[PDB]
Amino acid sequence: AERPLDVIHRSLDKDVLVILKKGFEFRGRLIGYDIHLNVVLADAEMIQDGEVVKRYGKIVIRGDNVLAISPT
Amino acid sequence: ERPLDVIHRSLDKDVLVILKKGFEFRGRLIGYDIHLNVVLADAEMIQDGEVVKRYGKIVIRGDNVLAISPT
Amino acid sequence: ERPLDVIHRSLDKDVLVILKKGFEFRGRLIGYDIHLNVVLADAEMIQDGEVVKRYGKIVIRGDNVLAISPT
Amino acid sequence: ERPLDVIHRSLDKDVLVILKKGFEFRGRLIGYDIHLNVVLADAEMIQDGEVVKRYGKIVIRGDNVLAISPT
Amino acid sequence: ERPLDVIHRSLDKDVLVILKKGFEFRGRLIGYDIHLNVVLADAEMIQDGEVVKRYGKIVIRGDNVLAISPT
Amino acid sequence: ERPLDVIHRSLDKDVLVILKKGFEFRGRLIGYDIHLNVVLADAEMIQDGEVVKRYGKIVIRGDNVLAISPT
Amino acid sequence: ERPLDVIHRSLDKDVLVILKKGFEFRGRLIGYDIHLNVVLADAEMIQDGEVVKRYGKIVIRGDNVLAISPT
Amino acid sequence: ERPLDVIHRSLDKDVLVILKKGFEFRGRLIGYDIHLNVVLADAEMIQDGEVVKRYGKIVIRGDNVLAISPT
Amino acid sequence: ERPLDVIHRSLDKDVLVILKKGFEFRGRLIGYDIHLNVVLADAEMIQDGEVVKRYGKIVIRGDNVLAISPT
Amino acid sequence: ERPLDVIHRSLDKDVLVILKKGFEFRGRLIGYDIHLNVVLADAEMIQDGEVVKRYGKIVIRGDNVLAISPT
Amino acid sequence: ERPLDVIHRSLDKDVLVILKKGFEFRGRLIGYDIHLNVVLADAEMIQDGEVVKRYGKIVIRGDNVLAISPT
Amino acid sequence: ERPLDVIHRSLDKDVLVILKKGFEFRGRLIGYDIHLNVVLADAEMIQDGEVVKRYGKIVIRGDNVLAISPT
Amino acid sequence: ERPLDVIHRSLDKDVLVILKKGFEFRGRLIGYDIHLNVVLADAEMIQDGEVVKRYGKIVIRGDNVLAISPT
Amino acid sequence: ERPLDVIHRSLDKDVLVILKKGFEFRGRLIGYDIHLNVVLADAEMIQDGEVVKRYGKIVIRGDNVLAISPT
RNA sequence: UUUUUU
RNA sequence: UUUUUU
RNA sequence: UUUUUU
RNA sequence: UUUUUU
RNA sequence: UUUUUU
RNA sequence: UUUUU
RNA sequence: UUUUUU
Ligand SMILES: [Ca+2]
Ligand SMILES: [Ca+2]
Ligand SMILES: [Ca+2]
Ligand SMILES: [Ca+2]
Ligand SMILES: [Ca+2]
Ligand SMILES: [Ca+2]
Ligand SMILES: [Ca+2]
């Protein structure tokens, strides 16, 4: 029953939340990932203290910076 | 009782995910892997006994995990 | 007297897990793995000489371990 | 869609390499590798939205990367 | 004399283990492995030139080691 | 222009090694390896745009590299 | 003039080990290995420019080295 | 339709296992692995067109397989 | 020009599979993997210019393969 | 039912071990490993259909196996 | 000089591929890999000094190769 | 009772090594390794029930082994 | 002196390459690798004591090698 | 006494190398490696009990080895 | 990409 | 589970 | 593709 | 290329 | 080289 | 041992 | 699938 890469695979093309280790989190459409847990987000927004401080049409995030990922 | 025995048996049960970052997550274990990445459902980010956040389902990268305790 | 010999023979006995962070755990070792992850039963988190929390059972990622001592 | 499909397609294109340590780099991606090391030509270090330095060509260890955004 | 030749010849000898953090353990080396995890007997934690603790036996995870010096 | 292509073409040329800590070394690239460890001759440790130290030859462990750039 | 060539080359010669945490080690190189672990003889630890400690022999874990320099 | 895609789709179906030796087995594929080992049910060993034997269940070492055909 | 380039650019095309045993199969290449296992559709086992057998779909373990030739 | 599921479920049951060399062994599977090496108790070497030898306990190198059959 | 140096320098040149079994292939080398798999264009299967077959292009699996000689 | 368990328990005991070749050895097991290489003392080569040779101590290459049987 | 030590030292010297197939090659060793593949210049395919063939340069897949002797 | 322990102990000594091809070499062991490749000086090829050839020094691919016995 | 499908 | 024992 | 150049 | 020197 | 000694 | 253990 | 693209 239901593992890391299953939820993530199934979350393809759906909106997710990427909480990083640093302190901030990104939000956007999950369009891809890899075994390292690297993820590609479309129409992403960099959220900080609850405020969208930056946006990117597409962004590739190194999975080692990832604290968690949640589907929205 | 090895780490993966305890974890695997905790499936569908409530567990505590103590992160090294300071805070912890509490929720229902529904999945995991060799890296100790874990999946919780009906999870709550807790900070000082304070539920400061909730998630329907959340995947936690195992290298952030400090420890895991089954409720 | 190798790391895994000592740890292994400590099965079902009381150990002292020192984390690199700051605190430590005290409890009966009931499991472990080649990554040095360890499972403790009747564990008590310790901060500055005082128990601050108790876990019936807890899996600690060996990655946060400084040392382990058979008490 | 996949991490590298994106990076690969960004060759000879402008990108933003967001560093873990705080700042970021902007330049034309002219190279990379499976470790995510990236090569930029005509790049600038960007601290607080401002250019603090320029490099005609610079190699960045993927070790220090947080993200890479095409364009 | 390679790293592990020196360590291997220190079995049952007194050694100094200088940790990364800021302190070190002094004691009799009775074991070790490839990761540089070491096992000391009749050991003592030394914080700023002072024994702040004592362990009859302790397995230190090699990852926390800065240096080992045969005394 | 893969990372190692640029680094290879840099043999016996001057390069700037930007470290993670906060400083940089400037010298002639006369060697390197798969880990991105590099060797520099007639090198200068530079702190704040200032030559704070010098070394006829130095080996910089790749793990401390933020980026290397050909001047 | 690759990293290990220079290091190998320095066997039995005087070197300076720059650790990432600020201090350095001066001594005669007498051994090493692939992880960059180094063995020094007649070594002294240096901080803010002064000798703070001496070791007849010392094995440094390499994972802590920034650079090594012959002489 | 990679090799394992076809084999995966043949689960619970009838296949022909052509062995390097010269004979073959015929049966219902009920399992397999990455080495190409295969498990057949109600299998009949065939030699020059003759059923020479029957096995309600048999595990064949893929090392002995030349080809598998979905019938 | 590389072995796998040719194979990959042969998908959905007719190929000639020469086995080491002595014979050969002809058919349309509908799949393969890095072990050089291959999948043919509408295949014909050939013994001295004669169609001795026919398989609508067959998977061959690359280990039995001597060479593969397009058209 | 994967190759190893079937084998594992046969522990302490009678099985047939068909070797590549033509003959076979019949016995009660009392063990095995991932290489497909298996152990049998009260085994019988068979050839042409007759017991030509008996062994109390025999370990067969998995590399010699053609197929294994339960019952 | 080294196997691949020689094999790499022969690209687009005529080579003789001597197979373990009873024969050889002659043709222009257009591609190869690390398994020593070779790709020949305008190839002729040679046997007992005579040409028995011609292939516009053929991929030879390295483990069937005995030796490769640059014409 | 896994393969390497039976072999380990036969140390300093009499065993029978059936070679895949054609003949077999008989002697006292004094050592082995992961490859199933084995070392025998007072070994006797046996062919067709006849001792054709004797060895004080012989080292046998594992991949030549068909089986091993404790006397 | 070790396998590769001897081989390395025979560079540019005449050697005998005894193949497993039976025949042997004689030539000047100009190169080799860890798989034990070797390159001979001015080579002679020797059979039953007769030079039945010659090659200016030839790469021999070490997989067919039985031995190599320095002349 | 593990396989390689016996082999190592035999250095600079007379041993017998029983090849799987049938014949056997004899000579002084002056080297070897983890593949079981061995080197003999002043070696003799023994075919059916009689010396058929001599070698000042020969390197034998451990792949053809059946066993080795210290004279 | 996780579904045994490398 | 480290005890060669995967 | 081997040339340290993954 | 073996020489710890990847 | 195998000896815990990469 | 295979059962994500 | 090989095309750096895991
Ligand atoms: Ca899958
Ligand atoms: Ca063990
Ligand atoms: Ca290269
Ligand atoms: Ca070397
Ligand atoms: Ca050793
Ligand atoms: Ca399991
Ligand atoms: Ca690709």
Q: How close are the terminal C-alpha atoms of chain F, in Å?
A: 16
Longest dimension (CA), chain N: 33
The shortest C-alpha distance from C71 to chain E (Å) reads 8
Protein-to-nucleotide distance from the CA of F3 to the C1' of Q5, whole angstroms: 8
E23: alpha, beta or left? (left if phi > 0; alpha if psi -120 to 50): beta
Closest approach of I38 to chain K, Cα-based (Å): 13
Nearest CA in chain D to F36: D61
CA of G6 to the centre of ligand 4 (A): 14
Which chain M residues contact residue K70 at CB under 8 A?
56-58
Distance K8 CA to Q3 C1' (A): 10
H or E element, residue E9: helix E3-9
Q: CA angle, M8 as apex, M6 and M14 as ends, to 5°?
A: 80
> Which of D12, D17, D11 has the alpha carbon at shortest distance from D69?
D17
Spell out which residues of chain I touch residue H16, defining contact as CB-CB under 8 Å: 55
- H-helix or E-strand spanning residue E7: helix E3-9
Sequence-distant (6+) residues with CB within 8 A of F35 are F61, F62, F63
The H or E element that residue M6 is part of is: helix M3-9
Q: Which residues of A touch B (CB under 8 A)?
A: 1-8, 17, 21, 37, 63-64, 66-71
Spatial separation of the C-alpha atoms in residues N31 and N15, rounded to whole Å? 12
Q: Locate tokens 């999948």: which residue?
A: I39
Q: In this structure, are residues F39 and F29 in contact, taking their beta carbons and an 8 Å threshold?
A: yes
User: Cβ contact (<8 Å) for E2 and G61?
Assistant: no
The 10 Å CB-count burial string (b at 16+, else e) for G20-53 is: beeebbbbbbbbbbeebbbbbbebbbbeeeeeee
List bases in chain Q with any atom under 7 Å of a protein Cβ.
1-2, 4-6
Give J34 CA → P6 C1' in Å. Answer: 8
Cα atoms in the Cβ-side hemisphere of radius 13 Å centred on G20: 19
Check: CB of residue C11 under 8 Å from CB of residue C29.
yes
Q: Determine the Cα–Cα distance for residues B36 and B30; give it in Å rounded to an integer.
A: 13
N58 close to M10: Cβ distance less than 8 angstroms: no
The letter for the amino acid at B66 is: L
Spatial separation of the C-alpha atoms in residues F65 and F59, rounded to whole Å: 12
Q: How many DSSP H helices and E strands does chain L contain?
A: 1, 5
The answer to whether the beta carbon of residue J8 comes closer than 7 angstroms to any atom of strand T is yes
Distance CA F38, CA F68 (A): 10
Q: Which residues touch A51 (CB under 8 Å, ≥6 apart)?
A: none
* CA G30 – CA H49 distance, rounded (Å): 72
At N8, which helix (H) or strand (E)?
helix N3-9
**Token pair recorded at residue A70:** 């949640």
What backbone torsions phi and psi does residue L49 show, to the nearest 5 degrees?
75, 0
Identity of the residue in E3, E16, E69 whose CB atom sits nearest the CB atom of G37 = E3
DSSP letters for chain J: --HHHHHHHHTTSEEEEEETTS-EEEEEEEEE-TT--EEEEEEEEEETTEEEEEEEEEEE-GGGEEEEEE-
Which tokens go with D26?
């902007």
CA E50 from centre of chain: 16
CA nearest to B31 within chain A: A3
Work out whether strand A25-33 and strand A15-20 pair parallel, antiparallel, or are unpaired.
Answer: antiparallel
Per-residue DSSP letter, F36: -
CA J5, CA H38: separation in Å to the nearest integer?
11
Closest C-alpha among C33, C60, E27, C4 to residue C70:
C4
Residue G20: DSSP 8-state: T
DSSP H helices, chain F, are: 3-9
Whether the CB-CB separation of L58 and L42 falls below 8 Å is answered with: no
Enumerate the β-bridge partners of residue L60.
Answer: L38, N67
First to last CA, chain A: 21
B51 burial (CB, 10 Å; 0-12 / 13-18 / 19+) is exposed
| Cβ contact B31 with chain T strand, < 7 A | yes
Interface test with N, best of L59, L65, L68 (most N CBs within 10 A): L59
Q: How does DSSP assign I1-70, residue by residue? A: --HHHHHHTTTTSEEEEEESSS-EEEEEEEEE-TT--EEEEEEEEESSSSEEEEEEEEEE-GGGEEEEEE
d(CA L10, CA D30): 62
> In 3D, which of B14, B45, B50 has the Cα closest to residue B29?
B14
β pairing state of K65-70 and K14-19:
antiparallel
The answer to whether I35 touches I62, Cβ cutoff 8 Å, is yes
Q: At which residue do the structure tokens 């692995």 appear?
A: H33
Instruction: Write out the residues of chain K at the interface with chain I, using a CB-CB cutoff of 8 A.
Output: 11, 19, 21, 25, 30-33, 35, 37-39, 55-61, 64
CB neighbour list of residue D50: distance below 8 Å, 6 or more residues apart = none
Burial class (CB in 10 A: 0-12, 13-18, 19+), K50: exposed
Record: contact C39-B63, CB cut-off 8 A: no
Separation between Cα atoms, residue L39 and residue G47, nearest integer Å: 55
Measured between alpha carbons, how far is H29 from H42 in angstroms, rounded to an integer?
A: 9
Backbone angles phi, psi at E3, to 5 degrees: -35, -55
Q: How far in angstroms lies nucleotide P1's C1' from the CA of residue C4?
A: 9
- Domain layout of chain C by residue ranges: 1-71
Residues 6+ apart with CB under 8 A from L49: none
Residues in chain B: 71
- φ, ψ (nearest 5 deg) of residue B12: 70, 10
- I29-46 in b/e form (b: 16+ CB < 10 A) is bbbbeeebbbbbbebbbb
Which ligand has the nearest atom to the CA of F2? 3
| H34 CA from O5 C1′ (Å) | 9
Ligand nearest to the CA of F8: 3
At residue E55's C-alpha, the angle toward residues E53 and E61, to 5°, is 100
Best of M14, M16, M20, M66 to disrupt the N interface (most N CBs within 10 Å) is M66
H or E element, residue E56: strand E51-60
C chain contacts of residue B67, beta-carbon cutoff 8 Å: 58-61, 64
The Cα J17–Cα J9 span in angstroms is 15
Residue J56 CA to its chain's centroid (Å): 13
Helix (H) or strand (E) holding E4: helix E3-9
Distance of alpha carbon I69 from the chain centroid:
8
User: N15 vs chain M: nearest CA distance in angstroms?
Assistant: 16
Residues paired with M69 in a beta bridge? M16
The encoded tokens of residue G41 equal 């003889």
Q: Give the class (CATH, top level) of J1-71.
A: mainly beta
H/E/C letters for each residue in chain H?
CCHHHHHHHCCCEEEEEEECCCCEEEEEEEEECCCCCEEEEEEEEEECCEEEEEEEEEEECHHHEEEEEEC
Looking at chain B, the number of H-run helices and the number of E-run strands are 1, 5
Give which of H37, H40, H34, H32 is closest to H16, Cα–Cα. H40
Strand O contacted by D21 CB (< 7 A): no
Helix (H) and strand (E) counts in chain F: 1, 5
For chain I, the farthest-separated pair of C-alpha atoms sits apart, in whole angstroms, at 33
In degrees, to the nearest 5, what angle opens at C-alpha C25 toward C-alphas C23 and C26?
140
Q: Which residue in the block uniquely carries the two structure tokens 């462990």?
A: F61
In a 3-state reduction of DSSP, which class is residue C9? helix
Q: What is the DSSP letter of K56?
A: E
Rounded to a whole number, what is the distance in angstroms from the first to the last CA of chain N? 17
Pairing of strands L24-32, L38-47: antiparallel
Nearest residue to U4 via alpha carbon and C1': D33
- Taking alpha carbons only, the member of A58, J15, C65 closest to residue B67 is C65
Which residues sit directly before a break in chain C (C to N > 2.5 Å)? Answer: none
Q: Which residues of C touch E31 (CB under 8 A)?
A: 1-3, 5-6
Tell me how crowded residue J6 is: count the other CB atoms within 10 A of its CB: 21
Contact M70/N64, CB-based, under 8 Å? no
User: How many other CB atoms are there within 10 angstroms of residue F42's CB atom?
Assistant: 14
Residue type, G29: L
What DSSP character marks residue F50?
S
Task: Give the 3-state secondary structure of residue A38.
Answer: coil
Residues of I in contact with H62 (CB under 8 A): 61
Closest CA-bearing residue to C1' of P1: C33
CATH assignment of A1-72, among 3.60.20.10, 2.30.30.100, 3.40.50.300, 3.40.1530.20: 2.30.30.100
Distance (Å) from CA H69 to C1' R2?
A: 48
Q: Which two tokens stand for residue E63?
A: 């990852």
Q: How far apart are CA L2 and CA J29, in angstroms?
A: 10
User: According to the 3-state scheme, what is the secondary structure of chain D?
Assistant: CCHHHHHHHCCCEEEEEEECCCCEEEEEEEEECCCCCEEEEEEEEEECCEEEEEEEEEEECHHHEEEEEEC
Q: Which residues of I touch K58 (CB under 8 A)?
A: 67-69
